[PDB]
From Swiss-Prot, chains A, B:
Keywords: Oxidoreductase. The lineage of its organism: Bacteria, Pseudomonadati, Pseudomonadota, Gammaproteobacteria, Enterobacterales. PROSITE patterns: GST_CTER. The keyword rRNA processing does not apply. This is Glutathionyl-hydroquinone reductase YqjG. It comes from Escherichia coli (strain K12).
């Protein structure tokens, strides 16, 4: 992947290090959308929330981008944020606007051909990875943010005076708990599956995969005590976990060798999976062809044939009872 | 891998064909152990049944070889047939007598170091596969047989006068049924998983994998009618299916991507699995370290890193009740 000036470098990303930190371009897109256009805690100001200015480039495959679409539905932001969906196969050009795949839309704004052109437009000398999601400012032709965690907080409150549905997925009373959960699930899970799936030695695969199943056992106890992770309210920590769980059986079990148990084997994890899947709006953010083509085909080092496993059987519309059982 | 005269050919076999599937010894060794020393239906005599003469070479990882160990146990042939176990990693050299791995015994007769030395010591102008099991004649230093299916049929009877345990796993009454079963289970399943596992085309893959699961479902139905495949008697057809089943969850499901359902998800197939596993002495013929190392480490084309997955959870020691349910 990678842009260097760029200067997309199809892989050569790049001649070692020797210079250096990709770079100054690291901190490049961390501004915040705010209710009044003041700067948020990083970046500059200027990004007041309003209709018809902001746009989301996403992949349906990627969990980081998924979470921005979920929060866009829950918050009722569709009237304010329009969306393009990159193509799911992410090869030597990185993400692409090819629309030959159902649900890939192409760049419905500028018709570029590659996501990296959005990034070059915003910054002709950019150096760094070219990722989804991107929260793009159509008035200034630039990137507000491409940090998924921070876009979800903007969406959580920045449009509140403009008509966003009532809802706080990070409310002050729960913030400390949510932050502990988020760091523990990042570590052992959202990114313990990736260390397993791309480990290169057995020792490494082993210690990763063990963290994954130890965290899933712990989660199964917490979600056996109440409907969501912190209690009976849905938070951003549940949304983050859910985007990993919804891909676990279609891909991580077989693709990443996370294969001790399927999520369908855990009573509480699997009920939590359907419970959120069944919230009005959310099913339609889920596109399994994209998720499956993306992981199976894009990672040639892991899966040289590019064959897509027929996949663990399951059915996420089965009723779950969790709205009643607890409390 | 393969011998050519030979003349072991590491991997290359090779740059062209034009006739054909090697060769005049593509039967190889098809002699029979008989209670009198007369020729069996193929091959020559005089391999009379007796003690201190015959030896099996096998891998614990390989199902054709595994069935010979099970029939050795069921029939009480320990005092008649001594055993050597090749190493589970089958690389450039094919099977090997490397002995640095619990339960791999090295060649305990001649301390050869490669299996192909045995086949050459016995035909030095030999052309074809160098496979386990091999039933070896310590007297004449030659191979009676390397045909699994015939070795196990010799074991039914050749040693009864000399004191084998009672049992006949290929009885005339059941042979027609047994032969039909042996056929479709080979087509659609024992081979079906290798087909899916080695497909290069996605379309090949889909086709193989679907046939696997259509056979599992047919089996799960038959095995809900009586304890075993043909009725209430155990046969070699049961032992052939079992030997596949028992590798299905720890290998085939992840490594060959046959992942729609684990055997542990089917009431009758998994009880059949546990039923035979628990027969006295069968458990000790099953070594999952050899099995899993062999398959994940030897197929470097399917599994670049040779990382062995943690493996689907199962517990074969749970009581199964199929002794009571039937008939």
């Amino acid at each position: 992947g990678q842009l260097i000036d760029g200067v997309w470098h199809d892989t050569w990303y790049d001649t070692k290090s020797t210079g250096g930190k990709f770079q100054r371009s690291a901190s490049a897109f961390r501004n915040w959308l705010t209710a009044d256009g003041a700067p948020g805690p990083t970046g500059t100001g200027g990004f007041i929330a309003e209709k018809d200015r902001y746009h989301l480039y996403v992949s349906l495959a990627c969990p980081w981008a998924h979470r921005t679409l979920i929060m866009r539905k829950l918050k009722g932001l569709e009237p304010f944020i329009s969306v393009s969906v990159v193509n799911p196969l992410m090869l030597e050009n990185g993400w692409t606007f090819d629309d030959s795949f159902p649900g890939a839309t192409g760049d419905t704004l500028y018709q570029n051909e590659f996501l990296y052109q959005l990034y070059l437009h915003a910054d002709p000398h950019y150096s760094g990875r070219v990722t989804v999601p991107v929260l793009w400012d159509k008035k200034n032709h630039t990137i507000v943010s491409n940090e998924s965690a921070e876009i979800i907080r903007m969406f959580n409150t920045a449009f509140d005076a403009l008509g966003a549905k009532a809802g706080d997925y990070y409310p002050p009373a729960l913030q400390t708990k949510i932050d502990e959960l988020n760091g523990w699930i990042y570590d052992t899970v959202n990114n313990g599956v990736y260390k397993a799936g791309f480990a290169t030695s057995q020792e490494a695969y082993d210690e990763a995969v063990a963290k994954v199943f130890e965290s899933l056992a712990r989660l199964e106890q917490i979600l056996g005590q109440h409907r969501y992770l912190t209690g009976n309210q849905l938070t951003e920590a549940d949304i983050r976990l859910w985007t990993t769980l919804v891909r676990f059986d279609p891909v991580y079990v077989t693709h990443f060798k996370c294969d001790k148990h399927r999520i369908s084997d855990y009573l509480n994890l699997y009920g939590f999976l359907r419970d959120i899947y069944q919230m009005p709006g959310i099913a339609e953010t889920v596109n399994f062809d994209h998720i499956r083509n993306h992981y199976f085909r894009s990672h040639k080092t892991i899966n040289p044939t590019g064959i897509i496993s027929i996949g663990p059987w399951q059915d996420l519309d089965e009723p779950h009872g969790r709205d009643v059982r607890f409390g």
